[PDB]
Amino acid sequence: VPRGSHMIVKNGEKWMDRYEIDSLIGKGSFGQVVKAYDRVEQEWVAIKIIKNKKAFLNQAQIEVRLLELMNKHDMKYYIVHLKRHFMFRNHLCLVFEMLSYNLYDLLRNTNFRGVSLNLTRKFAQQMCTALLFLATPELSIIHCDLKPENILLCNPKRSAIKIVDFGSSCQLGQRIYQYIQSRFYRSPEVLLGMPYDLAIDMWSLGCILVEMHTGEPLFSGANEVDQMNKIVEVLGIPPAHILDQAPKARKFFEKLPDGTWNLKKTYKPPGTRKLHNILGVETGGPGGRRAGESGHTVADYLKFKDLILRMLDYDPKTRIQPYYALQHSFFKK
Ligand SMILES: Cc1nc2ccc(-c3cc(N)nc(N)c3)nc2n1C[C@H](C)Oc1cccc(Br)n1
């Protein structure tokens, strides 16, 4: 008799005379991931096991529908492929291609020194092409949980990547959750309790590309208030037209009589932490480690910093969209 929501995983057991369970290869809020051998297909698979709990089951039904939608608009370009799903022992089970480790593990492999600007640019091209495909009118899909941990290497030897975990994903106009995105990668509009569109994913990507090159999160807030303050340190006070609509503006800011917003009394002065110095543009890159190294020139750093600031625009209406981000000078050969 199953106790609560957990499937009890036993290694070596064979499910429906097809899946030979090998090991637990991951765990999350939604349940767990197992490495399994598919006898029929004669190959390795990762099976996401959804917890036998109603909230998680409903969200995983939306994951199957969106994964099926995306996989039907194919050949494969940058989204994890859903092979099939089935009910087993009262758990919904999602079968995926066996993949390599996540981009946070890749950073930990090189002691958080960071990947080269050349590798950062290859990850940025695949991510922007992926966000371009999500923005397709037939899809209009918001990932909502972009982070290094939901970006997987196909193979440890190459740089090809796939986006995984559409567990909190929604389509444009089907927002159902106030509280979304991992805090470090959480957009201003989500912190402010505002409605969101596909632009919140471009905000996550900006934060992610800086972290891959520096080896550290751009915005490492301990809580929502700390997170907002860390963003203001770099980007300054948000435009008044945005704060005037934000339900949670008075969680971090206060209106003055003359009608200008400032930070709640109780960090660097707003906008004084320059991305220019965080990238060490003129002083040899992150911790000065890329000094003189080929492909890390001041000119190369200026194009990258330019593209990142367009990704971190406070206005979702003027935040660079996937198509225009691919036309950026940071990508021309
Ligand atoms: C080796 C491998 N191939 C995979 C293929 C797909 C998935 C996967 C995982 C989740 N949460 N959602 C989807 N839609 C697909 N996960 C794979 N994994 C484990 C991966 C490295 O770890 C990960 C990655 C993310 C979450 C967790 Br826990 N662990």
mmCIF file of C-alpha atoms and ligand atoms in Angstrom:
data_model
loop_
_atom_site.group_PDB
_atom_site.id
_atom_site.type_symbol
_atom_site.label_atom_id
_atom_site.label_comp_id
_atom_site.label_asym_id
_atom_site.label_seq_id
_atom_site.Cartn_x
_atom_site.Cartn_y
_atom_site.Cartn_z
ATOM 1 C CA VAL A 1 0.000 0.000 0.000
ATOM 2 C CA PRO A 2 1.619 3.329 -1.170
ATOM 3 C CA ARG A 3 2.250 5.853 1.704
ATOM 4 C CA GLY A 4 1.505 9.412 0.411
ATOM 5 C CA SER A 5 2.701 10.624 -2.985
ATOM 6 C CA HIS A 6 6.067 8.841 -3.442
ATOM 7 C CA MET A 7 6.537 5.933 -5.976
ATOM 8 C CA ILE A 8 8.869 3.383 -4.259
ATOM 9 C CA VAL A 9 11.617 2.880 -6.921
ATOM 10 C CA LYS A 10 13.353 -0.581 -7.011
ATOM 11 C CA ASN A 11 16.452 -0.945 -9.277
ATOM 12 C CA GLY A 12 16.511 -3.977 -11.673
ATOM 13 C CA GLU A 13 12.661 -4.279 -11.802
ATOM 14 C CA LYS A 14 11.056 -4.277 -15.310
ATOM 15 C CA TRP A 15 7.847 -2.231 -15.909
ATOM 16 C CA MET A 16 5.135 -3.547 -18.299
ATOM 17 C CA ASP A 17 7.764 -6.013 -19.725
ATOM 18 C CA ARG A 18 9.454 -2.940 -21.354
ATOM 19 C CA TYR A 19 11.275 -0.610 -18.874
ATOM 20 C CA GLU A 20 14.245 -2.065 -16.920
ATOM 21 C CA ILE A 21 14.830 0.494 -14.107
ATOM 22 C CA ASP A 22 18.614 1.185 -13.656
ATOM 23 C CA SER A 23 18.897 4.066 -11.077
ATOM 24 C CA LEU A 24 17.499 7.362 -9.702
ATOM 25 C CA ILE A 25 19.097 10.068 -11.959
ATOM 26 C CA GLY A 26 17.255 13.071 -10.363
ATOM 27 C CA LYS A 27 14.639 14.380 -7.877
ATOM 28 C CA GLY A 28 12.360 17.492 -7.818
ATOM 29 C CA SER A 29 9.054 18.974 -6.486
ATOM 30 C CA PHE A 30 7.079 17.034 -9.179
ATOM 31 C CA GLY A 31 8.456 13.556 -8.134
ATOM 32 C CA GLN A 32 11.579 11.891 -9.597
ATOM 33 C CA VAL A 33 13.590 10.902 -12.700
ATOM 34 C CA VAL A 34 14.928 7.357 -13.382
ATOM 35 C CA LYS A 35 17.354 5.885 -15.925
ATOM 36 C CA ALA A 36 15.624 2.874 -17.573
ATOM 37 C CA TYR A 37 16.367 0.497 -20.467
ATOM 38 C CA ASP A 38 13.579 0.262 -23.073
ATOM 39 C CA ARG A 39 13.822 -3.389 -24.341
ATOM 40 C CA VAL A 40 11.404 -2.725 -27.288
ATOM 41 C CA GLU A 41 13.304 0.333 -28.667
ATOM 42 C CA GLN A 42 16.678 -1.186 -27.498
ATOM 43 C CA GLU A 43 17.905 2.129 -25.940
ATOM 44 C CA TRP A 44 18.273 4.240 -22.751
ATOM 45 C CA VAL A 45 15.470 6.579 -21.522
ATOM 46 C CA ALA A 46 14.872 9.032 -18.642
ATOM 47 C CA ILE A 47 11.399 8.477 -17.090
ATOM 48 C CA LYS A 48 9.986 11.468 -15.195
ATOM 49 C CA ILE A 49 7.704 10.009 -12.446
ATOM 50 C CA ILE A 50 4.915 12.433 -11.352
ATOM 51 C CA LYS A 51 3.930 12.176 -7.623
ATOM 52 C CA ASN A 52 0.488 10.551 -7.005
ATOM 53 C CA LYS A 53 -0.904 13.936 -5.739
ATOM 54 C CA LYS A 54 -3.712 15.854 -7.537
ATOM 55 C CA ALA A 55 -2.028 19.359 -7.858
ATOM 56 C CA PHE A 56 1.121 17.832 -9.497
ATOM 57 C CA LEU A 57 -0.933 15.437 -11.685
ATOM 58 C CA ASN A 58 -2.936 18.418 -13.193
ATOM 59 C CA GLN A 59 0.252 20.458 -13.890
ATOM 60 C CA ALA A 60 1.875 17.352 -15.508
ATOM 61 C CA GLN A 61 -1.241 16.978 -17.817
ATOM 62 C CA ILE A 62 -0.484 20.513 -19.097
ATOM 63 C CA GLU A 63 3.235 19.473 -19.488
ATOM 64 C CA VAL A 64 2.172 16.473 -21.715
ATOM 65 C CA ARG A 65 -0.181 18.679 -23.844
ATOM 66 C CA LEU A 66 2.503 21.422 -24.386
ATOM 67 C CA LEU A 67 5.281 18.827 -25.038
ATOM 68 C CA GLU A 68 2.975 17.062 -27.539
ATOM 69 C CA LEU A 69 2.104 20.420 -29.174
ATOM 70 C CA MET A 70 5.817 21.427 -29.513
ATOM 71 C CA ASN A 71 6.947 17.968 -30.765
ATOM 72 C CA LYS A 72 4.133 18.064 -33.433
ATOM 73 C CA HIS A 73 5.621 21.313 -34.932
ATOM 74 C CA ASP A 74 8.683 19.367 -36.282
ATOM 75 C CA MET A 75 13.423 16.900 -36.914
ATOM 76 C CA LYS A 76 14.132 18.582 -33.480
ATOM 77 C CA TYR A 77 15.532 22.099 -32.701
ATOM 78 C CA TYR A 78 16.371 22.696 -29.017
ATOM 79 C CA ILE A 79 13.346 21.373 -26.996
ATOM 80 C CA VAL A 80 13.418 17.944 -25.211
ATOM 81 C CA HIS A 81 11.336 15.358 -27.173
ATOM 82 C CA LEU A 82 8.508 13.494 -25.333
ATOM 83 C CA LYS A 83 8.632 9.873 -26.613
ATOM 84 C CA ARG A 84 5.364 8.857 -24.834
ATOM 85 C CA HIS A 85 3.543 8.852 -21.469
ATOM 86 C CA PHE A 86 1.566 6.143 -19.637
ATOM 87 C CA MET A 87 -0.010 5.568 -16.223
ATOM 88 C CA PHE A 88 1.935 3.047 -14.061
ATOM 89 C CA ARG A 89 0.947 2.143 -10.440
ATOM 90 C CA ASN A 90 -1.156 5.392 -10.194
ATOM 91 C CA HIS A 91 1.795 7.628 -11.332
ATOM 92 C CA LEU A 92 1.814 9.504 -14.677
ATOM 93 C CA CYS A 93 5.186 8.613 -16.391
ATOM 94 C CA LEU A 94 6.858 10.818 -19.069
ATOM 95 C CA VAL A 95 9.501 9.071 -21.248
ATOM 96 C CA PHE A 96 12.395 11.188 -22.607
ATOM 97 C CA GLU A 97 15.687 10.687 -24.515
ATOM 98 C CA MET A 98 18.538 9.990 -22.064
ATOM 99 C CA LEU A 99 20.548 13.297 -21.977
ATOM 100 C CA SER A 100 23.787 14.583 -20.331
ATOM 101 C CA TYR A 101 24.237 16.853 -17.235
ATOM 102 C CA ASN A 102 22.824 20.392 -16.751
ATOM 103 C CA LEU A 103 24.613 23.771 -17.333
ATOM 104 C CA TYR A 104 24.991 24.344 -13.544
ATOM 105 C CA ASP A 105 26.966 21.024 -13.345
ATOM 106 C CA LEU A 106 29.072 22.229 -16.353
ATOM 107 C CA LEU A 107 29.995 25.435 -14.389
ATOM 108 C CA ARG A 108 30.773 23.373 -11.211
ATOM 109 C CA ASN A 109 33.083 21.151 -13.419
ATOM 110 C CA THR A 110 35.377 24.207 -14.019
ATOM 111 C CA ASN A 111 35.276 25.501 -10.372
ATOM 112 C CA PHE A 112 32.723 28.298 -11.295
ATOM 113 C CA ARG A 113 35.510 30.097 -13.283
ATOM 114 C CA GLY A 114 32.865 30.264 -16.080
ATOM 115 C CA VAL A 115 32.733 29.142 -19.759
ATOM 116 C CA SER A 116 34.499 31.188 -22.497
ATOM 117 C CA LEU A 117 32.582 33.993 -24.285
ATOM 118 C CA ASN A 118 32.804 31.701 -27.413
ATOM 119 C CA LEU A 119 30.932 28.862 -25.560
ATOM 120 C CA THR A 120 28.482 31.429 -23.998
ATOM 121 C CA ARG A 121 27.624 32.629 -27.560
ATOM 122 C CA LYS A 122 26.851 29.033 -28.765
ATOM 123 C CA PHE A 123 24.491 28.519 -25.736
ATOM 124 C CA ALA A 124 22.918 31.965 -26.429
ATOM 125 C CA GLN A 125 22.269 31.084 -30.148
ATOM 126 C CA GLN A 126 20.551 27.774 -29.275
ATOM 127 C CA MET A 127 18.519 29.412 -26.406
ATOM 128 C CA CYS A 128 17.393 32.377 -28.620
ATOM 129 C CA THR A 129 16.451 29.925 -31.488
ATOM 130 C CA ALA A 130 14.517 27.868 -28.845
ATOM 131 C CA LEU A 131 12.704 31.004 -27.517
ATOM 132 C CA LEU A 132 11.999 31.947 -31.206
ATOM 133 C CA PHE A 133 10.233 28.561 -31.713
ATOM 134 C CA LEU A 134 8.257 28.907 -28.404
ATOM 135 C CA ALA A 135 7.031 32.324 -29.722
ATOM 136 C CA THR A 136 5.549 30.670 -32.905
ATOM 137 C CA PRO A 137 1.816 31.758 -33.054
ATOM 138 C CA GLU A 138 0.574 28.085 -32.889
ATOM 139 C CA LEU A 139 2.690 27.578 -29.691
ATOM 140 C CA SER A 140 2.896 30.955 -27.801
ATOM 141 C CA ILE A 141 4.525 28.900 -24.955
ATOM 142 C CA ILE A 142 6.025 30.525 -21.800
ATOM 143 C CA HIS A 143 8.575 28.122 -20.233
ATOM 144 C CA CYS A 144 8.333 30.088 -16.895
ATOM 145 C CA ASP A 145 11.253 28.196 -15.195
ATOM 146 C CA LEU A 146 14.387 28.877 -17.317
ATOM 147 C CA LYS A 147 17.548 28.213 -15.229
ATOM 148 C CA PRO A 148 20.939 26.410 -15.776
ATOM 149 C CA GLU A 149 19.385 23.240 -14.150
ATOM 150 C CA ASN A 150 16.614 22.985 -16.873
ATOM 151 C CA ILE A 151 19.207 23.257 -19.714
ATOM 152 C CA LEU A 152 20.838 19.863 -20.535
ATOM 153 C CA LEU A 153 23.897 18.977 -22.673
ATOM 154 C CA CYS A 154 23.004 16.338 -25.319
ATOM 155 C CA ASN A 155 26.536 14.878 -24.782
ATOM 156 C CA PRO A 156 29.418 15.876 -22.346
ATOM 157 C CA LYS A 157 31.821 16.122 -25.392
ATOM 158 C CA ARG A 158 29.755 18.705 -27.412
ATOM 159 C CA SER A 159 27.902 22.020 -26.739
ATOM 160 C CA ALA A 160 24.443 21.074 -28.241
ATOM 161 C CA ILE A 161 21.691 21.759 -25.631
ATOM 162 C CA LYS A 162 18.000 20.961 -25.032
ATOM 163 C CA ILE A 163 15.492 22.792 -22.766
ATOM 164 C CA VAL A 164 13.599 20.438 -20.361
ATOM 165 C CA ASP A 165 10.841 20.774 -17.660
ATOM 166 C CA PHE A 166 7.669 22.438 -19.009
ATOM 167 C CA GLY A 167 6.128 21.620 -15.577
ATOM 168 C CA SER A 168 5.119 25.286 -14.857
ATOM 169 C CA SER A 169 4.740 26.267 -18.566
ATOM 170 C CA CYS A 170 1.564 28.020 -19.846
ATOM 171 C CA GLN A 171 0.390 29.463 -23.189
ATOM 172 C CA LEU A 172 -0.014 33.273 -23.723
ATOM 173 C CA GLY A 173 -3.303 34.269 -21.956
ATOM 174 C CA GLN A 174 -3.525 31.094 -19.727
ATOM 175 C CA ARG A 175 -1.528 32.448 -16.726
ATOM 176 C CA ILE A 176 -2.705 30.432 -13.657
ATOM 177 C CA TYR A 177 0.144 31.053 -11.101
ATOM 178 C CA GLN A 178 1.145 34.428 -9.515
ATOM 179 C CA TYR A 179 4.387 32.873 -8.302
ATOM 180 C CA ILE A 180 6.707 31.507 -10.993
ATOM 181 C CA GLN A 181 10.438 31.445 -12.094
ATOM 182 C CA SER A 182 13.403 30.399 -9.832
ATOM 183 C CA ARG A 183 14.130 33.570 -7.704
ATOM 184 C CA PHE A 184 17.630 34.323 -9.211
ATOM 185 C CA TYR A 185 16.061 34.261 -12.760
ATOM 186 C CA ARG A 186 12.736 35.951 -11.757
ATOM 187 C CA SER A 187 11.710 38.935 -13.992
ATOM 188 C CA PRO A 188 10.687 42.343 -12.466
ATOM 189 C CA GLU A 189 7.077 41.981 -13.771
ATOM 190 C CA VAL A 190 6.732 38.638 -11.830
ATOM 191 C CA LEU A 191 8.305 40.176 -8.626
ATOM 192 C CA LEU A 192 5.781 43.079 -8.985
ATOM 193 C CA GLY A 193 2.763 40.646 -9.221
ATOM 194 C CA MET A 194 2.073 41.855 -12.804
ATOM 195 C CA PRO A 195 0.695 39.740 -15.722
ATOM 196 C CA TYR A 196 3.506 38.210 -17.866
ATOM 197 C CA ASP A 197 4.027 37.157 -21.499
ATOM 198 C CA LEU A 198 6.833 35.345 -23.398
ATOM 199 C CA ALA A 199 9.244 38.238 -22.474
ATOM 200 C CA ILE A 200 9.857 36.762 -18.944
ATOM 201 C CA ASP A 201 11.837 33.885 -20.634
ATOM 202 C CA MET A 202 14.129 36.421 -22.401
ATOM 203 C CA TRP A 203 14.797 37.973 -18.923
ATOM 204 C CA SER A 204 15.808 34.522 -17.518
ATOM 205 C CA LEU A 205 18.114 33.950 -20.567
ATOM 206 C CA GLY A 206 19.935 37.302 -19.952
ATOM 207 C CA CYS A 207 20.664 36.366 -16.295
ATOM 208 C CA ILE A 208 21.730 32.831 -17.440
ATOM 209 C CA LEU A 209 24.240 33.960 -20.162
ATOM 210 C CA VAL A 210 26.046 36.319 -17.675
ATOM 211 C CA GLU A 211 26.261 33.488 -15.055
ATOM 212 C CA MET A 212 27.688 30.999 -17.627
ATOM 213 C CA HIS A 213 30.562 33.445 -18.455
ATOM 214 C CA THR A 214 31.206 34.784 -14.849
ATOM 215 C CA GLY A 215 30.472 31.459 -13.069
ATOM 216 C CA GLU A 216 28.182 33.292 -10.565
ATOM 217 C CA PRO A 217 24.477 34.432 -10.610
ATOM 218 C CA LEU A 218 24.066 38.093 -11.703
ATOM 219 C CA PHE A 219 21.247 38.536 -9.102
ATOM 220 C CA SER A 220 21.591 36.214 -6.048
ATOM 221 C CA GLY A 221 18.646 37.519 -3.889
ATOM 222 C CA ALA A 222 17.972 35.645 -0.586
ATOM 223 C CA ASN A 223 14.242 36.610 -0.809
ATOM 224 C CA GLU A 224 11.998 38.721 -3.137
ATOM 225 C CA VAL A 225 13.035 42.095 -1.532
ATOM 226 C CA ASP A 226 16.802 41.237 -1.743
ATOM 227 C CA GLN A 227 16.262 40.066 -5.383
ATOM 228 C CA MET A 228 14.541 43.365 -6.414
ATOM 229 C CA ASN A 229 17.290 45.419 -4.646
ATOM 230 C CA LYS A 230 20.059 43.433 -6.488
ATOM 231 C CA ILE A 231 18.334 44.240 -9.857
ATOM 232 C CA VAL A 232 18.011 48.014 -8.998
ATOM 233 C CA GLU A 233 21.770 48.070 -8.090
ATOM 234 C CA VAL A 234 22.416 47.254 -11.777
ATOM 235 C CA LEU A 235 19.406 48.610 -13.718
ATOM 236 C CA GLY A 236 18.258 51.607 -11.557
ATOM 237 C CA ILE A 237 14.663 52.421 -10.386
ATOM 238 C CA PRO A 238 11.997 50.817 -12.774
ATOM 239 C CA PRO A 239 10.042 53.247 -15.113
ATOM 240 C CA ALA A 240 7.180 55.043 -13.251
ATOM 241 C CA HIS A 241 4.655 53.860 -15.916
ATOM 242 C CA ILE A 242 5.435 50.223 -14.829
ATOM 243 C CA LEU A 243 5.355 50.777 -11.010
ATOM 244 C CA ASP A 244 2.010 52.745 -11.448
ATOM 245 C CA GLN A 245 0.352 49.426 -12.601
ATOM 246 C CA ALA A 246 2.308 46.957 -10.337
ATOM 247 C CA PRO A 247 0.121 45.471 -7.500
ATOM 248 C CA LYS A 248 3.273 44.758 -5.412
ATOM 249 C CA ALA A 249 5.196 48.038 -6.152
ATOM 250 C CA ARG A 250 4.796 48.997 -2.446
ATOM 251 C CA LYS A 251 6.600 45.744 -1.570
ATOM 252 C CA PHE A 252 10.014 47.309 -2.534
ATOM 253 C CA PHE A 253 9.354 51.000 -3.452
ATOM 254 C CA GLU A 254 7.482 54.141 -2.235
ATOM 255 C CA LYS A 255 5.900 57.057 -4.190
ATOM 256 C CA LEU A 256 7.121 60.607 -3.259
ATOM 257 C CA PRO A 257 4.670 63.619 -3.285
ATOM 258 C CA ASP A 258 6.048 64.878 -6.696
ATOM 259 C CA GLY A 259 5.123 61.331 -7.968
ATOM 260 C CA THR A 260 8.566 59.677 -8.382
ATOM 261 C CA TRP A 261 9.322 56.195 -6.994
ATOM 262 C CA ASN A 262 12.327 55.482 -4.701
ATOM 263 C CA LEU A 263 13.431 52.311 -2.786
ATOM 264 C CA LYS A 264 11.709 51.472 0.552
ATOM 265 C CA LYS A 265 14.036 53.036 3.217
ATOM 266 C CA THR A 266 14.676 49.584 4.937
ATOM 267 C CA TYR A 267 23.019 48.042 -1.274
ATOM 268 C CA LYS A 268 24.851 50.241 -3.843
ATOM 269 C CA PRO A 269 23.007 53.386 -5.130
ATOM 270 C CA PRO A 270 20.476 52.485 -7.939
ATOM 271 C CA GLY A 271 22.218 51.657 -11.298
ATOM 272 C CA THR A 272 25.851 52.130 -9.964
ATOM 273 C CA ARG A 273 26.816 48.388 -10.252
ATOM 274 C CA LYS A 274 27.720 48.459 -13.944
ATOM 275 C CA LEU A 275 27.481 45.214 -15.976
ATOM 276 C CA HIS A 276 30.636 46.734 -17.610
ATOM 277 C CA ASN A 277 32.600 46.092 -14.353
ATOM 278 C CA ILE A 278 30.790 42.793 -13.465
ATOM 279 C CA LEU A 279 31.977 41.444 -16.871
ATOM 280 C CA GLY A 280 35.426 43.020 -16.190
ATOM 281 C CA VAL A 281 35.173 44.340 -19.804
ATOM 282 C CA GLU A 282 38.475 46.332 -19.652
ATOM 283 C CA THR A 283 40.157 44.452 -16.716
ATOM 284 C CA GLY A 284 40.518 40.922 -18.237
ATOM 285 C CA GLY A 285 36.987 39.402 -17.836
ATOM 286 C CA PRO A 286 35.345 37.687 -14.781
ATOM 287 C CA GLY A 287 37.935 37.705 -11.934
ATOM 288 C CA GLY A 288 40.332 39.027 -14.669
ATOM 289 C CA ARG A 289 40.829 35.372 -15.854
ATOM 290 C CA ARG A 290 40.438 35.980 -19.663
ATOM 291 C CA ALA A 291 43.276 38.610 -19.842
ATOM 292 C CA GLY A 292 44.715 38.730 -23.419
ATOM 293 C CA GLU A 293 43.045 35.338 -24.304
ATOM 294 C CA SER A 294 41.764 35.136 -27.938
ATOM 295 C CA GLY A 295 38.022 35.893 -28.442
ATOM 296 C CA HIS A 296 37.803 38.009 -25.225
ATOM 297 C CA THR A 297 38.556 41.511 -26.667
ATOM 298 C CA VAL A 298 36.950 44.768 -25.363
ATOM 299 C CA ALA A 299 34.982 44.911 -28.694
ATOM 300 C CA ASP A 300 33.709 41.295 -28.166
ATOM 301 C CA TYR A 301 32.655 42.151 -24.558
ATOM 302 C CA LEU A 302 30.824 45.372 -25.697
ATOM 303 C CA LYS A 303 28.538 43.440 -28.173
ATOM 304 C CA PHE A 304 27.755 40.801 -25.446
ATOM 305 C CA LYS A 305 27.045 43.515 -22.778
ATOM 306 C CA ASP A 306 24.824 45.323 -25.366
ATOM 307 C CA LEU A 307 22.770 42.187 -26.050
ATOM 308 C CA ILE A 308 22.471 41.365 -22.285
ATOM 309 C CA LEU A 309 21.108 44.883 -21.429
ATOM 310 C CA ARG A 310 18.460 44.538 -24.237
ATOM 311 C CA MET A 311 17.488 41.179 -22.559
ATOM 312 C CA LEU A 312 17.198 42.909 -19.124
ATOM 313 C CA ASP A 313 14.993 45.840 -20.301
ATOM 314 C CA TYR A 314 12.461 46.605 -17.452
ATOM 315 C CA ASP A 315 9.652 47.069 -20.106
ATOM 316 C CA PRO A 316 8.378 43.652 -21.441
ATOM 317 C CA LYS A 317 6.976 45.573 -24.465
ATOM 318 C CA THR A 318 10.537 46.833 -25.379
ATOM 319 C CA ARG A 319 12.568 43.779 -24.146
ATOM 320 C CA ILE A 320 14.412 42.316 -27.219
ATOM 321 C CA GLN A 321 12.338 39.433 -28.759
ATOM 322 C CA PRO A 322 13.996 36.141 -29.980
ATOM 323 C CA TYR A 323 14.040 37.162 -33.709
ATOM 324 C CA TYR A 324 15.789 40.560 -33.124
ATOM 325 C CA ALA A 325 18.242 38.996 -30.550
ATOM 326 C CA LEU A 326 19.440 36.581 -33.346
ATOM 327 C CA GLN A 327 20.143 39.629 -35.628
ATOM 328 C CA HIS A 328 22.389 41.184 -32.906
ATOM 329 C CA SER A 329 26.055 42.011 -33.791
ATOM 330 C CA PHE A 330 27.115 39.661 -30.923
ATOM 331 C CA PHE A 331 26.149 36.773 -33.325
ATOM 332 C CA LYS A 332 27.347 37.871 -36.843
ATOM 333 C CA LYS A 333 30.214 35.542 -38.045
HETATM 334 C C1 LIG B 1 19.981 12.404 -17.905
HETATM 335 C C2 LIG B 1 18.666 12.980 -18.268
HETATM 336 N N1 LIG B 1 18.074 12.886 -19.445
HETATM 337 C C3 LIG B 1 16.876 13.587 -19.307
HETATM 338 C C4 LIG B 1 15.843 13.860 -20.188
HETATM 339 C C5 LIG B 1 14.785 14.580 -19.720
HETATM 340 C C6 LIG B 1 14.752 15.027 -18.382
HETATM 341 C C7 LIG B 1 13.637 15.852 -17.875
HETATM 342 C C8 LIG B 1 13.583 16.268 -16.549
HETATM 343 C C9 LIG B 1 12.513 17.086 -16.127
HETATM 344 N N2 LIG B 1 12.448 17.488 -14.847
HETATM 345 N N3 LIG B 1 11.547 17.507 -16.983
HETATM 346 C C10 LIG B 1 11.622 17.126 -18.277
HETATM 347 N N4 LIG B 1 10.659 17.538 -19.127
HETATM 348 C C11 LIG B 1 12.657 16.298 -18.749
HETATM 349 N N5 LIG B 1 15.767 14.791 -17.532
HETATM 350 C C12 LIG B 1 16.773 14.083 -18.016
HETATM 351 N N6 LIG B 1 17.872 13.621 -17.359
HETATM 352 C C13 LIG B 1 18.234 14.030 -16.018
HETATM 353 C C14 LIG B 1 18.791 15.428 -16.017
HETATM 354 C C15 LIG B 1 20.279 15.503 -16.277
HETATM 355 O O1 LIG B 1 18.533 16.030 -14.740
HETATM 356 C C16 LIG B 1 17.423 16.762 -14.571
HETATM 357 C C17 LIG B 1 16.919 17.785 -15.365
HETATM 358 C C18 LIG B 1 15.803 18.452 -14.927
HETATM 359 C C19 LIG B 1 15.215 18.114 -13.720
HETATM 360 C C20 LIG B 1 15.819 17.096 -13.015
HETATM 361 BR BR1 LIG B 1 15.170 16.519 -11.323
HETATM 362 N N7 LIG B 1 16.881 16.439 -13.420
#
